[PDB]
Symmetry: C2
Subunit: 401 residues, 2 copies
């Protein structure tokens, strides 16, 4: 079964909702992926930060193998013995009272919007169904009807309406725009990524998150920080918001929360928000004992291998080296920790897709995000010499055009 | 760590979005659950049909353990070697051209609504954002803002608006009401459960699904059958719709699709619907190689152990025996296969909660659904003598009041 056969079979029997980079992977371990032909690649996407710990981390694998023989799912009609250990662990780790467990990132975002609205009505005193949520242009939090109703990307929402009302959109990285938007007393929450991943690793200016915190507090608005991609050591801190020492009202986690072994996501917040949802009023596989064992292990790997500090150090090296590329062809380099992107001067001859095809040819896997943006985001377990070898692949590729 | 300690820890550190039956489970195998005190229970919920194959089926466990060491997640930016084998398998099994993989049931329902709307606009020719979707009262398909916008249960939507427009609701089990609703040419789809699970195992009348098929065809409306709970042998056929030999336009699968080992869900339909979504326009962990290995195994267990035929035979026995209970206390018995429920004459002295507490005391786990409905739904691997022992527990419990 060749790579072309894999491409062809999916084309026959699977929906056409993606056009992946033409490479067919069979095995992953740490920073490396192997295709069915046996070729070896640096993984410079890390499954959008879901494998921050590297592919198939043995401690996370071992947690899954141990728990799968015991109990994998009771549903929340009953209690399982694991969920509470995990809740105590993660809430103490991030210093919120409570966690609401879900499965995918978009489910955590949906839960956050529901909390915001219930809190708006029952605590802030907004009149029923006037509550607003404000989002930043370029945000991405998944693909339900609600999440695409807050999107400014036409490919995500065009042809899928009508849309969820009550969602307002302002520019990213713009404190006067947030201040203006929050003059409306019916706003219940502002949801924002500390760095916008799918928009192309858009890093806001120093001080933006501090201003977001202050403005949300000043106007009695919940600050929801979406760290589903940026959290869990990817940017060089436990949360990307830690760079500005700000405490969001709601923090969303996902992706790396399982090391890529299981869909686990989390909504963290204090009692005054969490308990506006009463028994029977929300839920989901959420909180199952298998995913909880996996996530405990995945978090322990992050702390025990000091991956945030490694991501900080190596991300400095990565951005410094990438800035040595010619401004003729690479027009920007941006990122924090090991979440980085370059922008290429797209001609009609070359574009980010062709660059990623050639990087693939040269043993490195990256994906383009808008026709001129390429993300460079290897697992945080990468070592300095591996990183420098990968950078030289990048340099060879870009300078080969 | 006692059962009371487990209750207490979750109360401290977890959201209060459930009030589970007070029992703390540590181990599951086949039809049985064990709590942390070591007590043994018949599982008569089957995690809402996610463990149709029984808890921890060894073939599904073995598929997970084999694949977790190889590769668990590349994301859909690249191809993995497993997804296509699974797509070919499941599409050939249910005889649709294509599958769109997702993770949770509500994500499959969201995908279905998105397909319906895109198809409405781009194929049926509905004007943009006039498309309607019709749902049946009592439907349940999860807890996103969209799904609660179609709900008629106030606890699911009250305090969480404003709501998704374009969703219309008619009575269940009512062909004249569907016919009336479909006179509107802007209706793109009707979504319906062949038996409504969370509503209390509401079985529609013989011929309802045939009439739904005919009316949807007559009026150029997509018939979306939600078999996330009813499918995969639970009701005694591969799909609950097979009892009426009808072919929906979209079939949703979930829950048992993984044997409870992994959140896997599926959207099945033919090219003329599926391919209205283009690359970049929808997605998600969806289609990851670990979940695909699990789901292949889980489907093979269903076919190889002939669980649909077992569910049919034993469900006949279960309903016959339950009907022997006095009409003074049990006012209805309903179900197909091993998806069944009883309705109890709730006084102020007794209610379904107290019944389930006592069943728990007597070694059987069931959950109440509306204050007077108790579901009886053990895994399909149950044997006749185990089923009769469980029935006698039910009889002892109900007659003890």
């Amino acid at each position: 079964p060749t790579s072309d056969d894999i491409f062809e079979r999916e084309y026959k029997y699977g929906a056409h909702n993606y056009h992946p980079l033409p490479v067919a992977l069979e095995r992953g371990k740490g920073i490396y992926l192997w295709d069915v032909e046996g070729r070896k690649y640096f993984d410079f996407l890390s499954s959008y930060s879901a494998v921050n710990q590297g592919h198939c981390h043995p401690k996370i694998v071992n947690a899954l193998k141990s728990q799968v023989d015991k109990l994998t799912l009771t549903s929340r009609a009953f209690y399982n013995n694991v969920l509470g250990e995990y809740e105590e662990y993660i809430t103490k780790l991030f210093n919120y009272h409570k966690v609401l467990p879900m499965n995918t990132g978009v489910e955590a975002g949906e839960t956050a919007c529901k909390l915001a609205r219930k809190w708006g009505y029952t605590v802030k005193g907004i009149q029923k169904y006037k509550a607003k949520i404000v989002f930043a242009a370029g945000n991405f939090w998944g693909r339900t009807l609600s999440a695409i109703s807050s999107s400014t990307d036409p490919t995500s929402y065009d042809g899928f309406g009508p849309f969820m009302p009550g969602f307002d959109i302002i520019p990213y990285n713009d404190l006067p725009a947030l201040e203006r938007a929050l003059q409306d007393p019916n706003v219940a929450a502002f949801m924002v990524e500390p760095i916008q991943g799918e928009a192309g690793v858009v890093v806001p200016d120093p001080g933006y998150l501090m201003g977001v915190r202050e403005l949300c507090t000043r106007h009695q608005v919940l600050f929801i920080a979406d760290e589903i991609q940026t959290g869990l050591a990817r940017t060089g801190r436990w949360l990307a918001v830690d760079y500005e020492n700000v405490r969001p009202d709601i923090v969303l986690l996902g992706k790396a929360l399982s090391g890529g072994l299981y869909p686990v996501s989390a909504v963290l917040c204090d009692d005054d928000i969490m308990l506006t949802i009463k028994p029977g009023e929300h839920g989901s596989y959420g909180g199952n004992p298998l995913g909880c064992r996996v996530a405990i292990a995945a978090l322990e790997v992050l702390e025990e291998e000091n991956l945030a500090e490694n991501a900080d150090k190596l991300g400095i090296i990565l951005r410094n080296e990438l800035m040595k590329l010619p401004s003729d062809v690479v027009t920007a380099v941006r990122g924090k920790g090991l979440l980085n992107a370059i922008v290429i001067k797209e001609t009609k001859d070359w574009d980010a897709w062709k660059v990623c095809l050639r990087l693939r040819d040269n043993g490195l896997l990256a994906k383009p995000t808008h026709g001129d943006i390429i993300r460079f985001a290897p697992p945080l377990v990468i070592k300095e010499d591996e990183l420098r070898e990968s950078i030289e692949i990048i340099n060879k590729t870009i300078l080969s055009f």
